[PDB]
Symmetry: D2
Subunit: 447 residues, 4 copies
């Protein structure tokens, strides 16, 4: 027989810190190892590289994988859905304890490798393997892992399908059914219906926005709103700063496109930006006009900003990090005047990002925005679209994959509750064919 | 013995008065009066459909003005017995009921013509050809955007094109010997509309530099941060939910504001795009979109069917049920869960249409933030969900201006005074903070008026 | 060749089952079944008055069980055709309709006696002497707090005193050969009540140490932080608003839950204290407080007047209007803005009572967090405010237990399993987090059940 | 004639930073000078004594009184309602610019004098005068200032009535009609009705809780709830910490009373506590049992806490500051483990205070509470009653004083909006007999 087990290690009580392990008989396939970036800020300057794994488990921070000492099997892989820190962030801190390769899609593999180049001299290390969407990699005789293309607030994001002798186990945390994306190709629907007909034993999926009604707005909407705010203005020569996730890439591409269309020169600031968009351009996921400038260290940035100041803000579009009000982020540094560029009345600050619903980040962004307003700035908030799927996206996902079991992951118990109600609309039953797991719990499927 | 100091004095003219009679304590029931010394211009006369439904039965028909004034409902113009002048005109911004709803009930007491843009005028006369008073009269005058009409020698009225949740909507500029008084309730700076013309920015700048004595403007979304999304966004989202689906042949009902001609036009475009026959239900839509098509503001495929009375609707809806929902797209009223509206009674099954599991109900409208309509819409959605429907909420974009749109409006008109209208005191508070950023001062250059109040501006 | 390891095995008995049939997806409509192998004990059978009013007309009278099951309304006991045992009793926690409301409609299909505490039993028989089925029968048995009743040799039922928003309310403990199953829906640890006895802590500790196999308990306010305020707080606040006023002779109406005997007792004490004659209106109050006084749970001054039918009420209310509101204190129903309740129709003026400016309306009740009742209460308060009334909101204290009260409940009973009931999945989620702090584990030692679901505990 | 002017200097746009000036012809009476304690925390360690007035005005922080250079009169007094920092906090920083005495009720005068003993070597200084409730002090021939007793979250809090040739101008920011107080005497109602009949030209009053329905709960309610939580527990020997406003005094008195009734020894920790309750006991506003201990510096506190730890928490009730999660406050220091006393599972933390509705303090209190919960603590939140008046308290205030004009103060424009609606119920009219002022604006009353 094939006894499948699903062990919840991280992120089913919280949003960050995601880690799941799928045990097929005695083989283990681990998916995702993220940091929880909120409850690290509760403590007074931690500097995550000064701490080793255990420290951070009693903060968590990183998922408590000690519970993996109680499970009956050996891990053969560490798969990663995409390159957000809530998914690949814990790798350089925990993956070394496992004698297993790290499988990911190219952009992720690259960014992982870049992050480990800060773990220490080496680590152990695991060998890092790049697998693209649409391709499949056999890990043992009968266990084979497949990558299926999807969209998310990061480029190159993927469904993972673990084929076993008794069927496929697909895990889909962090997706979005964007039918008209700015980057990448539309999600592989035909493959989802087909693989649905092949046989899915279990579905593990995010419940982030399952309570939200309807279907997720396309990234094209964010594109159009940003177009509207940048170009559709009767105060053309003001001085505009755009801030967003350094990781989003699709949007940054939209923004530099816009800069080329609105006759400004796009300058990208911050280590964050340099890493993500740099790695993106180098690996050819985005094209850049020859005029763009990218600066990471404080000297490059501040120099670029004195320059950008005295030559005229009207003829520039700084694109940067700091949308959640991170002090030390370039925007936080501009708001505090710890920079040559010092904003004046009329100046437009464009936040192409949501406010993360945590008191820490909300306080930070509050303080940031008031400092900006006292310096006369005019703020455009939340010109943004969520990269997570809504109720209807989930509904149709259930209707094409037709999974035999469903396990909500990547969220709080309330998010999970919303998802549960939706799945119950689909014919499922709690504790029977629909399962609510907590961090540290293992659910068995038989036969 | 000595010491000095010097100040220039004079010299002296125009006593302008602004009468807040309706829609300054609440939204809707809007009425403002612009008094230029001796002469008066009435702007907007709206109905408030909110605090009439709180009472057990609405009627609104065989009732005369006074009763609705103790409900309000209609603006209390009794305070106009206290003003020193005669109204020589009644202008209307656009054809929403919070703006023209009180006309067939109050405009008759005033010996003045009603000036509006063609579509508005049309809907006005259609409403008077329905209240049935027949009547003591007014001339209904059609003035299009971009044109100007002299009414009293020194008083001249200009229409300046803008966008809003209904087609053909306009800024009104009351030119006086000492400058312009601009009234801009219900507007939005949509630079990429689906219908109509882009708002006339250049004229706004010109008129700004000519001299604006006062700006009267809505504060509905002045608290909302940033700039209002284009209607194109609503178009793209609707396009996304109707076409972008992997459960294609289900049976889909779309509900929206009957007045939002642009949105319904987008929708029939979509039905034409998805091979369903667009059918429009409700007396209300036949009213609005019928008037729109007759006057040629929207183009319609001949595939369209429009039905107003219950018999036409219930039978067309038999037509669609028995023939198959798959090749049809009903667009309807009832988005606020109005009982008696076609959708609410469909939800109650008081109709041939029997909605089934999987069916998609698409609300291209927001929930009006009032406990009544929130309750009705709650009940509606639970009936629909229990009968298995799949609900797409708030596929919608606000037709009102945000903080930054107001910012640039102030920066183009550069008015000497500012008056928030069309909202609650809190909405007005947000607007006040915004204008305070713009250099204005409360009780001096920016004024918070309440219903029934007059501020005198003495300008030379 | 070698190596070792050792584990003790066995030995083996009691298969206990817990049936969640009602009130696990919503609040109210509560029904749970405790199956001890072969025998079944039904606990609570409540009505849900929420999702019945969403439909146009309530009736509830000439309807039989099934229809109300597709509304629910009443708990779906159809799933009891699938269980392997016979119910040999029906216990009721207290006399709120979310607990005993479904009895005259479902208890008849079960060949079992209905066990309750005296006041509850009384109200039950009063309700069956009203549904009018006459009927196929059950014996209505009065078991007081602190006493125990053997029903099936190994199954014995204990009543343990507690406090709650209605007088004489009880923990139920189902003793079995292998331990106790405690059901505690609707409770509160009030250590200083105005009425009743302080909850029986010592017995809870004893029974905790004896062995509790399962705890089934409400999660209504498990999300609320801290510990529930005593009823004494509600008493002191009411004392504060009624007596503590510098506008003394106005005319004051107090509205509250008819079931909240303790609160009304406080109020009549106050009327007796402020020299007004306490008059109680509504069929509902005559029901509850009448039953309370007849059975001697509350003492009443002979000044009191209690009127149930419209004629008595409208005339007593003529009495009070024409004689002067100043020397009277009407206590009434209608706090949720129920149209047809005496207060709502007073607000509509469908009554001799004509409330005037200055008059005080005192709501000793919370707003039930549902859009329907929130809308009704909105409308009520606006009618009252427009007619000049002065409104005192939420002079109230919740009758349900908070997080910390639950904490100590777990720490006294030390149950082997925990099951949240009586709430939504989110309420249950909060409770789950609380119990997880207590050492419990989801799907192992703490179970989230939905309506219609059974968890088997196999205990030796 | 007598032309009265009311100049709004601070706190009508915000809550903190209160300052009003009443000009009677050419004489000026200033009431309140507070700090805004929120928007000082937006900046990175300010240390308010390192900055002089102007610094803080461009932060504000302290009220911008530069606008007082444009008014036609000379100030003859600086009156203070009570000893909260939103009322007397700006005195040592601005009062030196004015050649005028500072009048207050004894507890305030004391605490003011204690605060100036940190302004510098001296300052100028103004002479500080103690005037009790019920007594009157003539400041010029015809202008005389009266103190009328009321309750508020601080002991000895007062209505100020400025009698002039044309009537009284009463300012009542921060009150509460507590008819059954724990401390002090019930508000002087008879005097309010009487003085109402004498003639009030203008009423300046707080709008903090005017939107809140009904009448403010008595302090007796907070007393009873605290009694219930401290005594009504079936886990008697756990270890309980009580945190509250060091300034409240009434509640601290309740708490030590309770400690005496529940057989624990009351220990009070923090500079804040020592100052406020110490000054209170010394001036005889509260009685203390002989057993109590008060410790202010880190050494006394930490020593007391090691002591209190090893001897047994069961036999102790630490009462302290830190309810808004101030890092450096004793509770914040306990939650971070920067103290000998280190909380364990079951321990009860009792917050007898509300959460101040500002993102800064909400974030701070968030972080605090999560640290406490991770250490196993069980939290009792908001066992508290607001010290501000509600709609009905305001209503009856209007009905006994019968003021000819009303000006809401001490709040945001929305609070002011709520108050406006209530006053309109009372017959008043905006811009005519009811006035909405902003910071920096002067309103004239004639005749
Ligand atoms: Zn992600
Ligand atoms: Zn994620
Ligand atoms: Zn409109
Ligand atoms: Zn409008
Ligand atoms: Zn109950
Ligand atoms: Zn209940
Ligand atoms: Zn205060
Ligand atoms: Zn204060």
């Amino acid at each position: 027989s094939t006894e499948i087990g699903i062990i919840a290690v991280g992120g089913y009580n919280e949003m960050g810190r995601n880690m799941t392990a799928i045990r097929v008989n005695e083989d283990i396939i681990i998916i995702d190892m993220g940091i929880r970036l909120d409850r690290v800020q509760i403590h007074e300057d931690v500097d995550t590289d000064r701490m080793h794994s255990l420290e951070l488990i009693e903060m968590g921070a990183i998922p408590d994988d000690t519970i993996m000492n109680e499970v009956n099997g050996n891990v053969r892989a560490i798969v990663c859905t995409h390159g957000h820190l809530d998914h690949i962030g814990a790798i350089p801190k925990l993956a070394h304890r496992y004698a297993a390769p790290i499988i990911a899609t190219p952009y992720t593999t690259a960014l992982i490798k870049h992050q480990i180049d800060s773990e220490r001299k080496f680590g152990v290390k695991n060998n890092i393997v790049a697998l693209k969407a649409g391709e499949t990699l056999e890990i043992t005789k009968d266990i084979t892992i497949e990558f299926i293309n999807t969209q998310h607030s990061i480029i190159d994001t993927v469904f993972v399908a673990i084929h076993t002798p008794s069927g496929a186990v697909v895990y889909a945390c962090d997706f979005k059914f964007d039918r008209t994306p700015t980057l990448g190709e539309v999600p592989d629907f035909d493959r989802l219906k087909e693989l649905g007909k092949e046989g899915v034993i279990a579905l593990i999926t995010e419940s982030t926005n399952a309570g939200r009604n309807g279907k997720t707005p396309s990234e094209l909407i964010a594109h159009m709103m940003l177009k509207d705010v940048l170009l559709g203005t009767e105060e053309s020569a003001v001085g505009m700063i755009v801030t967003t996730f350094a990781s989003h890439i699709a949007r940054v591409n939209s923004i530099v496109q816009f800069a080329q269309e609105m006759g400004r020169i796009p300058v990208l600031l911050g280590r964050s930006m340099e890493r993500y968009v740099g790695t993106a351009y180098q690996l050819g996921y985005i094209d850049l006009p020859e005029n763009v400038e990218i600066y990471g260290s404080r000297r490059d940035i501040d120099n670029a900003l004195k320059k950008i100041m005295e030559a005229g803000k009207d003829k520039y579009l700084p694109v940067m990090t700091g949308h959640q009000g991170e002090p030390g982020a370039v925007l936080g540094r501009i708001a505090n005047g710890e920079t040559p560029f010092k904003v004046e009345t009329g100046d437009r600050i464009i936040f192409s990002a949501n406010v993360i619903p945590n008191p820490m980040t909300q306080a930070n962004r509050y303080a940031l925005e008031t400092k900006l307003k006292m310096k006369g700035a005019r703020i455009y908030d939340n010109v943004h679209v969520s990269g997570h799927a809504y109720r209807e996206d989930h509904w149709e996902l259930l209707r094409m994959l037709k999974p035999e079991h469903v396990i909500p992951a990547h969220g709080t118990i309330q998010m999970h509750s919303e998802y549960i109600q939706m799945a119950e609309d689909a014919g499922y039953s709690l504790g029977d064919t629909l399962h609510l797991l907590r961090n540290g719990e293992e659910l068995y499927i038989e036969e």
